[PDB]
Each structure stands twice: as structure tokens, then as C-alpha cells.
Design a protein around this ligand. Sequence first.
Ligand SMILES: Nc1ncnc2c1ncn2[C@@H]1O[C@H](COP(=O)(O)OP(=O)(O)O)[C@@H](O)[C@H]1O
Length: 324
Amino acid sequence: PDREKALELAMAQIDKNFGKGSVMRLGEEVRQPISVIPTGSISLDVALGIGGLPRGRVIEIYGPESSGKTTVALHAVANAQAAGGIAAFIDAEHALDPEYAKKLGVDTDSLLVSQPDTGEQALEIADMLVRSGALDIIVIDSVAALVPRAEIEGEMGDSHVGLQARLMSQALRKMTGALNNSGTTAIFINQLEKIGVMFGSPETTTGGKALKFYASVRLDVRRIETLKDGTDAVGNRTRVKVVKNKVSPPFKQAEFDILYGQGISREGSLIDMGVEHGFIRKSGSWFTYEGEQLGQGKENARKFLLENTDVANEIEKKIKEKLG
Ligand SMILES: Nc1ncnc2c1ncn2[C@@H]1O[C@H](COP(=O)(O)OP(=O)(O)O)[C@@H](O)[C@H]1O
């Protein structure tokens, strides 16, 4: 190439008129911002390209029940709180469980939680609550539970059936500018492909029409396998694919563990992530760390870092220092 002449000038024009990262090649290591929100999984973190979800942008997390969406949502939230941040939770499902949130790192006490009466409301609240500039993150549990005021009151609206896609489009449009000027990232939980499921692949094509286009990031969270511990069902392994990422190349895979009541294993995430990058060395079942050993079985290894917090932070570091 010299072909690379006009092309690079072009792409400059694309990012010029249409948003920022409108065009890029799968193989890049983009700018890397200073403000991000770690997901709780370094694995996912790196797949997002920027070690956290983007700020001031809308984010769609979708997949089947019992996948890992809320957990992820709740972790992503526990952190906006560590850096002194205010988080809001718009609840249309009435299925949030504090004892679990808290167990993950979420200050439930200071966690704002609305319980909308119509979807048209839920969004109004979520908006004029955003136009504040006080919230760092806001989670909308269930995109489908936001029923229009007309379908819920039996009848009292316009342009009949197929309206809640309008309420979304018309609202998402307002939150866009609202979020792009306040630095509030929002997570929309979308309940219900994931490659490796099979049997068909559902019915009538939307990852939320509007949401599909508004979303800057879109996670495809699917449960890939339920875990064990020679005892029972400790948790399960989750697979997240980033089908959309306007902050860095998309289509990146991220896999991690989630344990009932515990959440995402940072430790277990560090091992499988530190070895693949030569930081950790498996041999004879010993996940030894440069000279000194960690544990016999990966579980016992998960536990080691769990006890040796100091050495675990040193691994998380080296890895994020090797890439981003
Ligand atoms: N109250 C809870 N107690 C124990 N584990 C829980 C609890 N809530 C969620 N989980 C864990 O999260 C997984 C499902 O994720 P979320 O609960 O993220 O569902 P979605 O995946 O959002 O339906 C479950 O398999 C379980 O391991």
C-alpha cells in the first residue's frame, strides 16, 4: 500500500463528521481514556479494550436469565461507588436483592432505587435524575419491563400497537445528549444469540431497535457452563462477547466465573488471565508465580490470592501493565 494515502485521510473524515470512532480496523490499540469503570473482571476489562466500560455512554447488556448480566451490572456499580460515585437503580422487575449487592461491594444504603409506575415514567425519572450531573452510573433493570402508560392503563395514548419501541427511541434520544455532557454511563439490562446454544435462535430480531443503535457498547452475556466443587453447584462460567464497541474494536471475547452469592471471581479471573500471558506458570498442577508456588488445584489457587491479597494485586498489575 500507498493506497494507505487517501484511506487514512478518509477515515479522518469519517471520524470527523460522524461521531469519533466510526471506522477502525479490528487490529488497533486505541487511545485509552483516563476515566473508565472496571467491570469486575480483568478478562472482560481487556476485551472492552479500555479496561472498563465507557463513561458518558449508554451500554446494553443482554442474554438469557441466569447469565451474568445483573452481577456484571452490580459489579460495574460497586466500583463507581468506590471512587466516590452516586449510582441509581431504576427497577421495573422488582428482583434486586441487597444482601447480594452488598456482598459484591455495593453500598446499598446510598444506592438510589426507583420503582416506576409506567415505562414512560421510568425513563423520565432516569432522565431528569441524570440531567443532575450527580450520578456516575445508572442501571435500568429490564428494557422489556418498561411498559408504555397506554398498554398498562388499558388504553390512553396514540399510534396504537408497537409503541414501547417508540417510547425507547424518543427517550434514548434525549438521554444521549444528557449523558454525553454529564459523564454518566447507563446500563440497560435486556432479558433474552450466544453461539453454542443451538435450537433455532429465538423470534423477531431486536436487541432493542433504538437501543441497538444508541448503545455504544453491547454485551452478549451467556452462561456457557454450570460449575461444581465435588459438593454441589457453586456457580457457573459466563461468556461475554462484545458485539458492539465504538470505543475500541469490537467482537472481543471475555470469559469468567460467577459464584452464587459471591459474584465474579477476580482471583479465578487473574489465574486464567495471568498464565495465558506467561505471567503465571502451570506445571505439575502448580500455578507457581515466578519462583514461588500458589496452589495445587486451581481452586486452592483461587484461594491463595484470596489469602495473599498482596501478591494477587501484583499479578493484576503486571497484566494490565503489559497491555493497557
Ligand atoms: N441472590 C443471589 N444469591 C446467589 N447467587 C446469585 C444471586 N443473584 C444472582 N446470583 C448469581 O448470578 C447468576 C445470574 O446472574 P444475574 O443474577 O446476573 O442474572 P441475569 O444473568 O441478570 O439473569 C446466577 O447463576 C447466580 O450464580
